[PDB]
Design a protein around this ligand. Sequence first.
Ligand code: CA
Ligand code: CL
Length: 491
Amino acid sequence: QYSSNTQQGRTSIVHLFEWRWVDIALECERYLAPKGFGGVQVSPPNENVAIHNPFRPWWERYQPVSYKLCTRSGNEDEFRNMVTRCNNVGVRIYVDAVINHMCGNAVSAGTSSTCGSYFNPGSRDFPAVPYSGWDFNDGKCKTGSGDIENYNDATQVRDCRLSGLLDLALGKDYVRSKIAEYMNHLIDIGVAGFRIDASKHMWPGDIKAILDKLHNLNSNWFPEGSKPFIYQEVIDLGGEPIKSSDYFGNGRVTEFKYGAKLGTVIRKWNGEKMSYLKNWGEGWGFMPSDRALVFVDNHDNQRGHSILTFWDARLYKMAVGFMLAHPYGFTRVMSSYRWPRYFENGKDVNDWVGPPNDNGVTKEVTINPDTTCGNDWVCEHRWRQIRNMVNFRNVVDGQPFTNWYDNGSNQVAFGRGNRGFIVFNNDDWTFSLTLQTGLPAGTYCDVISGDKINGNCTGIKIYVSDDGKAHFSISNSAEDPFIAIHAESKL
Ligand SMILES: [Ca+2]
Ligand SMILES: [Cl-]
């Protein structure tokens, strides 16, 4: 469960949040494959509640109605078509598995669902599964409201309703089996692994019993003995009875401390500065590198404060660049859509808005001639600075963090063995200095500013001498105040 199962030489996953299956399939072929992306985290592919007030919020996909592969992203045929096409070009698919719960207990009964299946939350009836009252934790939960009231009580956090979401009885073999049936459907289609949604709200042991029932990965694409990559969503900033380490037996765990702290540092808030990043990783109190699933932002937290997002493009690129260059963790890059972020004083009242759509029909991703995307899809994963750092990470895979430099403030640099070097200026003055890069002598294309094409560079050239040293000059007024070079950007 700890192996990503990506094709040899690919180290990142991208979240194509709310993208349709046909667009992901195309993206695998035209972009993700040639640009070295390891795989795609897809939005939940199972049937969910169609919520019409507010109008089709992104969060309706976190309220299951059944396990039919039938959503606004597409139907089963489209999902299967995507998985096959992506696997055929060496790009994996990872499914956001929503298995802790079905929908909100107050949602009206009917067929307001993405595949039209009937369901009745009040009577606990989901006949498309099927599940009935006996399959929820109503009787097991001990809180007066039936919902989670206190995170200091690990028991209720697991057995009670998260914000009223009907809580599945994962202690029961029937329920475990129905979830495994769904995940096995996905595995056989060709899925390489799962983001396990709301893992904190499930007993580590119940997750295990579910994973125990899964098939090995599809033997047309994966070697014998291959198991689904597992990364569990657990927000653990400390101070709670439930810890990320409680889930290590099942697979990787999201390290939410990662983006939170990085955001703080790059914004230079709370006294933080980039020079402090010299011991980034376990030195900052993070979980073991071999268990961490890292990211600067995710689909939930890019909607709140502090976290760096595409809205903060300049600092965001820097944060993502640092993440992709640093050996800690397994990296996930975000890809978003733009929504009319309207604030009512520290409150984005439009943080619920779903993907770009025509009367609820998700819009296709259009590609502009300059490689950006239209229809309000942000496509951060296509931004040159990020796309090139995704490749940097592949190029330097396995090389140790070395050659750290800092000016005691916010000008820092470091290398990855003899294969890559990166330099950042987040201070309010110019960074002009000769640094030891650890790289072989030569002329290297800076892949932040440009690209190596046909024996020359479109952007900045860095000259590494025989002793491995090179001069770097980065103005604080630079749009992208960082430079990155690697073995494959050498002329
Ligand atoms: Ca639960
Ligand atoms: Cl996540």
